[PDB]
């Protein structure tokens, strides 16, 4: 029983189903493979096409999943899609009314076309199963919990008909107890509010990071006009006929004006974030109080995108409403894609479930066999120096104890947004200045936001207040208080209100990462590291060896540890050996606008990425000429000869484009097919 789970939209690599398809139209595309009821592989398409939360069809994700399973496409018994067919097709139909030149291709025909063209797979119609959206969520959240029954709450922006759903789960049976309609969306409320902070889709976590800096009392009575808690776990959100945003009209009427790009957060902005976070907490605890009492259940699984609000999750943990709480590492739509595979297996009879509670999110493609890794790092030699220590973990622990910030890349990439010891950046958690330091190091701007700690299972209760319910901490799903007498010791990872989003690593959840944190604890007396994701501000979490080396060379980390190899950048890295390649969305443009007296105006050159929200950058006439000659095989240095050679100015210009990922820059060739490592 080999079942593929699919979520996302249907766009090709280089174009979208309609031009500039909005970033929220079926996002976080991913592919998941289950076999005999176990999740054998899962990866988000964003890791492979390098577009954060991409909506594009997850063709590469499917290819990677089939290879991790040793399967041909034709081996797949069924395909589950995370929305009902009529809903996705009606939304596509609406996009087609807005773009009358777009050919009428609905979801079943598009899925069949992408798989046939992209993999030579003729998918028979009877193998494609469409699934109710919150049902897919609930299966993913509950089947990995290891509980034999639970109350299951799903909250997100919306499924086909609901913004929230409540189930009772028993064995492999879901029974729906309640639902909440689309206009009551809490994910909708949170995203509406996020826009008022100069932020957008995918920035909700930054708003949650900002909330503890604010006073929730300032706007408490304003938000109280936008919701009413009601009897029997009900609630209302009070809409308006002015604009498609629940929040902006009332706040505008009271003089609140939205933050502009590059403007610093005012006290009003911090307070707004606080009252927003308090509002959603109050509503969800209202829901859960009613359904805990009504169902009588002591266990909760919480899924949907709203369940990535780890602040909310820590409040649920401390509420005493439940004895146990489980949250999946991918509770957003990538996890609904996984859940859609289980629902498809159930639809076709044979629903087999995982034998254990999920402990490791390490489920994507690996970096490769060590012989092809060694070989590929040699291709990077003009830019890096490599050491091959005898005990890389031991060396890494000492470097960390000496105060260096490390890139840490091992094995299979994490499913879901948190890095957990496979595509991570780690450093000493004690020094508070590591916050400003490592933020500048990776060109990010979340200094207001602390980093997440990782602690050994053994030491976990020596530093963190896990009490209340028994929650799962292998994925940083919960904010917990830092013990008051350890707060000053844990300066980099403790928030302004004394809390932290802790990963508890165990020998079972991640053996190598556990050994690393334990070893550092032996060396310093503090078995706590900070653990942030391995990516700069212009990319999702790095996936391949080439991605890892690129991100290392374009950030200011001290050392990279990748599959026992110690990597450092040469004193003068030779960019000229790198072969530039366009990404499928790269566009290179010379533009003339209108000028004064109706002349042809200013003539500028730019590079940009052709997707909704994609970045763009000005380029010099010289680099424009160089990049226009990119052929995918000639090196940057050889291409630069046509404009006089790779000057220091050009190399610096190229490097800044590299940092923003406008195009691929890597040595010639590639690492080759990922090795069958026998696991």
Ligand X SMILES: NC(=O)OP(=O)(O)OC[C@H]1O[C@@H](n2cnc3c(N)ncnc32)[C@H](O)[C@@H]1O
Ligand Y SMILES: COc1cc2cc(c1Cl)NC(=O)C[C@H](O)/C(C)=C/[C@H](C)[C@@H](O)CC(=O)[C@H](OC)/C=C/C=C(\C)C2
Query: Which residues define the annotated binding site for AMP?
Result: 187, 204, 305, 309, 333
Q: Report the distance separating Cα 70 and Cα 73, nearest Å.
A: 10
Q: Is 676 helix (H, G, I), strand (E, B) or coil?
A: coil
Show the binding pattern over residues 251-290: x = contacts a copy of itself (CB under 8 A), - = does not: -xx---xxxxxx----------------------------
Number of Cβ atoms within 10 Å of the Cβ of 677: 10
Place of tokens 């009551």: 184
> Looking only at residues 541 through 570 of this chain, which bind ligand Y when binding is defined by CB under 6 A?
none
C-beta of 277: minimal distance to ligand X in Å? 8
For ligand X, which stretch binds (CB under 6 A), given 110-118, 204-212, 357-365, 366-374?
A: 204-212
∠ CA(264), CA(477), CA(54), 5° rounding?
Answer: 65
CB of 352 to Fe ion, least distance (A): 24
SS3 content of the chain, % helix, strand, coil (to 5): 35, 20, 45
| Position closest to Fe ion via CB | 156
> Contacts with Fe ion in 316-335 (CB under 5 A)?
333
Q: Which does 496 bind (CB under 5 to 8 A by kind): Fe ion, ligand Y, a copy of itself, none?
A: none
Compare residues 132 and 233 and give the one whose CB is closer to Fe ion: 132
| Closest C-alpha among 166, 293, 283, 306 to residue 236 | 283
204 binds ligand X (CB under 6 A): yes
Number of residues in contact with a copy of itself under rule CB under 8 A: 72
Q: Which of 45, 64, 156, 428 binds Fe ion (CB under 5 A)?
A: 156
- Which is nearer to ligand Y, 187 or 453 (by Cβ)? 187
- Which residues, 6+ apart, have CB-to-CB distance to 393 below 8 Å? 512, 515, 516, 519
Q: How far is the CB of 642 from a copy of itself (least distance, A)?
A: 13
Q: How many CB atoms lie within 10 A of CB 331?
A: 29
From ligand Y, a copy of itself, Fe ion, none, interface partner of 260 (C-beta below 5 to 8 A by class): a copy of itself
The residue to which tokens 């706590």 are assigned: 528
Instruction: Pick the closer one to a copy of itself by CB: 620 or 633.
Output: 633
Which listed option, a copy of itself, ligand Y, ligand X, none, makes contact with residue 332 (CB within 5 to 8 Å by class)? ligand X
For residue 632, the partner it binds in a copy of itself, ligand X, Fe ion, none, with Cβ less than 5 to 8 A by kind, is a copy of itself
Work out how close the CB of 304 gets to ligand X at its nearest, in angstroms, rounded to a whole number.
5
Measured from the CB atom, the residue of 30 and 460 that comes closer to ligand X is 30
255: left (phi over 0), alpha (psi -120 to 50) or beta: left
- Residue 407 makes CB contacts below 8 A (sequence gap 6+) with 424, 425, 534, 548, 551, 552, 557, 559, 560, 561, 562, 567
Residue 308 binds which entry of ligand Y, a copy of itself, ligand X, none, with Cβ cut-offs from 5 to 8 Å by kind?
A: ligand X
136 is an interface residue for ligand Y by CB under 6 A = no
Q: Which of 12, 25, 250, 268 binds ligand Y (CB under 6 A)?
A: 25
What's the min distance (Å) between Cβ of 490 and Fe ion? 34
Identity of the residue, 19 or 403, whose beta carbon is nearer to a copy of itself in the bound complex: 19
414 scored as a contact of Fe ion (CB under 5 A): no
Two tokens, residue 588: 């290179």
The rounded distance, in Å, linking the Cα atoms of 98 and 313 is: 39
Partners of residue 459 on adjacent β-strands: none
Residue from 413, 438, 657 nearest 547 by CA: 413
Q: Which of 5, 8, 188, 481 binds ligand X (CB under 6 A)?
A: 188
Tell the smallest beta-carbon distance from residue 451 to ligand X (Å). 17
The strand pairing partners of 566, in sequence order, are 387, 561
Give the C-alpha separation, 239 to 246, whole Å: 6
- 163, 305 in Cβ contact below 8 A? no
C-beta separation of 488 from 397 below 8 A: no
To the nearest whole angstrom, how small is the minimum distance from the Cβ of residue 91 to ligand Y? 4
> In the stretch 345-374, what mask flags binding to ligand X with x, by CB under 6 A?
------------------------------
239 binds, options ligand Y, a copy of itself, ligand X, none, Cβ within 5 to 8 A by partner type: none
Does 271 contact Fe ion by CB under 5 A? Answer: no
Q: What are the helix (H) ranges across 369-480?
A: 370-379, 392-402, 434-441, 460-463
Which entry of a copy of itself, ligand X, Fe ion, none binds 188, CB below 5 to 8 A by partner kind?
Answer: ligand X
245 in contact with a copy of itself (CB under 8 A): yes
Dist CA 228 CA 236 (whole Å): 5
**Which SS3 state, helix, strand or coil, does residue 502 take?**
coil
Report the SS3 class of residue 561.
Answer: strand
Choices 36-44, 101-109, 427-435, 468-476 (CB under 8 A): range interacting with a copy of itself: 101-109
Where is the binding site, in residues?
26-27, 133, 137, 156-158, 187, 204, 305, 309, 333
Q: From ligand X, a copy of itself, ligand Y, none, which one binds at residue 595 (CB under 5 to 8 Å depending on kind)?
A: a copy of itself
For a copy of itself, the binding residues in 572-611 under the rule CB under 8 A are 581-601, 603, 610
Of 35, 114, 158, 297, the residue at the interface with ligand X (CB under 6 A) is 158
Number of residues that bind ligand Y (CB under 6 A): 15
Does residue 135 bind Fe ion (CB under 5 A)?
no
From edge to edge, which strands make up the β-sheet containing 78-81?
38-44, 30-35, 2-7, 78-81, 128-130
With H, G, I as helix, E, B as strand and everything else as coil, classify residue 247: coil
| Max CA distance (Å), the chain | 76
In the complex, minimum distance from the CB of residue 207 to ligand X, in angstroms, rounded to a whole number: 7
Binding status of residue 191 toward ligand Y by CB under 6 A: yes
How is 191-240 classified by DSSP, letter by letter? HHHHHHTT--TT-HHHHHHHGGGS-TTTTHHHHTTTEEE-STT-EEE---
Binding residues for Fe(3+) are 133, 137, 156, 333
Helix, strand, or coil (residue 42): strand
Residue placing its CB nearer to ligand Y in the complex, 94 or 356: 94
337 DSSP 8-state letter: H
Nearer to ligand Y, 237 or 426 (CB): 237
* DSSP one-letter string for 292-331: HHHH--SEEEEESGGGG-HHHHHHHHHTSS-SEEE--S--
Report the C-alpha gap between 421 and 506 in whole angstroms: 11
Contact 561, 392 (CB under 8 A): yes
Site for Fe ion in 642-661 (CB under 5 A): none
Question: Applying CB under 6 A, which of residues 100, 171, 244, 262 lies at the interface with ligand Y?
Answer: 244
Spatial distance between the Cα atoms of 411 and 370, rounded to a whole number of angstroms: 11
Provide the binding-site residues for ligand Y, judged by CB under 6 A: 24-26, 91, 94, 157-158, 187-188, 191, 201, 242-244, 333
Provide the binding-site residues for ligand X, judged by CB under 6 A: 28, 133, 156-159, 187-188, 190-191, 204-205, 208, 304-306, 308-309, 332-333
Provide the binding-site residues for Fe ion, judged by CB under 5 A: 156, 333
């Amino acid at each position: 029983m080999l079942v593929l789970g699919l979520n996302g939209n249907f766009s090709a690599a280089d174009t979208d189903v309609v031009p500039q398809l909005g970033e929220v139209f079926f996002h976080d595309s991913a592919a998941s493979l289950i076999r005999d009821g176990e999740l054998v592989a899962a990866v988000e398409e964003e890791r492979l096409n390098r577009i954060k939360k991409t909506t594009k069809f997850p063709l590469n994700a499917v290819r990677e999943c089939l290879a991790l399973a040793g399967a041909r496409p034709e081996d797949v018994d069924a395909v589950g899609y995370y929305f009902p067919e009529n809903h996705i097709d009606t939304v596509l139909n609406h996009l087609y009314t807005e773009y009358p030149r777009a050919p009428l291709r609905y979801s079943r025909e598009l899925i069949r076309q992408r798989l046939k063209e992209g993999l030579g797979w003729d998918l028979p119609d009877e193998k494609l199963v469409y699934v109710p959206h919150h049902e897919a969520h609930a299966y993913s959240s509950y089947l990995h919990s290891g509980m034999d029954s639970a109350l299951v709450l799903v909250l997100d922006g919306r499924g086909e008909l609901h913004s929230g759903t409540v189930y009772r789960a028993e064995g492999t049976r879901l029974e729906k107890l309640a639902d909440y309609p689309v206009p009551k969306s809490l994910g909708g409320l949170y995203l509406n509010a996020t826009y008022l902070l100069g932020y957008g889709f995918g920035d909700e976590y930054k708003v949650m990071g900002l909330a503890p800096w604010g006073n929730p009392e300032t706007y408490r009575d304003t938000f109280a006009k936008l919701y009413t808690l009601q009897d029997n776990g009900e609630y209302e959100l009070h809409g308006n006929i002015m604009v498609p945003n629940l929040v902006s009209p009332l706040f505008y009427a009271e003089g609140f004006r939205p933050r502009r790009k590059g403007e610093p957060f005012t006290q009003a902005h911090r307070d707004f974030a606080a009252a927003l976070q308090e509002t959603v907490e109050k509503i969800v605890l209202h829901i859960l109080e009613y359904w805990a009492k009504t169902s009588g259940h002591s266990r909760l699984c919480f899924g949907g995108g709203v369940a990535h609000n780890s602040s909310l999750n820590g409040l649920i943990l401390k509420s005493g409403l439940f004895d146990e709480v489980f949250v999946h590492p991918a509770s957003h739509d990538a996890g609904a894609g996984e859940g859609a595979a289980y629902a498809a297996a159930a639809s076709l009879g044979t629903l087999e479930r995982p034998g254990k509670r999920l402990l490791s999110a390490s489920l994507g493609p690996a970096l490769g066999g060590r012989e092809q890794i060694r070989a590929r790092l040699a291709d990077w030699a003009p830019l890096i120096d490599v050491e091959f220590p005898d005990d890389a973990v031991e060396t890494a622990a000492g470097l960390l104890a000496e105060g260096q910030v490390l890139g840490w890349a091992y094995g299979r990439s994490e499913f879901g947004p948190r890095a957990l010891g496979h595509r991570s950046i780690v450093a000493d958690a004690r020094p508070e200045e590591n916050r400003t330091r490592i933020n500048a190091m990776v060109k990010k701007r979340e200094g207001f936001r602390p980093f997440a700690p990782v602690v050994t299972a053994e030491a976990a209760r020596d530093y963190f207040d896990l009490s209340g319910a028994d929650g799962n901490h292998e994925f940083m799903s919960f904010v917990v208080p830092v013990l008051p007498e350890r707060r000053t010791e844990l300066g980099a990872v403790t928030h302004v209100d004394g809390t932290a989003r802790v990963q508890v690593v165990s020998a079972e959840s991640g053996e190598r990462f556990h050994r690393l944190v334990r070893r550092f604890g032996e060396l310093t007396g503090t078995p706590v590291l900070l653990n942030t994701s391995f990516n700069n501000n212009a990319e999702p979490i790095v996936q391949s060896l080439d991605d890892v080396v690129t991100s290392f060379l374009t950030t200011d980390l001290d050392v990279l540890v990748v599959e026992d190899c110690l990597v450092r950048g040469k004193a003068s890295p030779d960019l000229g050996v790198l072969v530039p390649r366009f990404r499928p969305v790269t566009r290179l443009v010379e533009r003339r606008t209108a000028g004064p007296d109706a002349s042809a105006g200013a003539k500028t050159h730019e590079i940009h990425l052709d997707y909704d929200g994609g970045p763009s950058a000005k380029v010099s006439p010289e680099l424009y000429e160089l990049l226009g000659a990119v052929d995918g095989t000639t090196t940057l240095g050889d291409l630069a000869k046509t404009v006089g050679g790779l000057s220091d100015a050009l190399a610096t210009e190229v490097f800044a484009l590299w940092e923003q990922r406008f195009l691929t820059l890597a040595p010639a060739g590639d690492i080759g097919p990922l090795a069958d490592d026998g696991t």
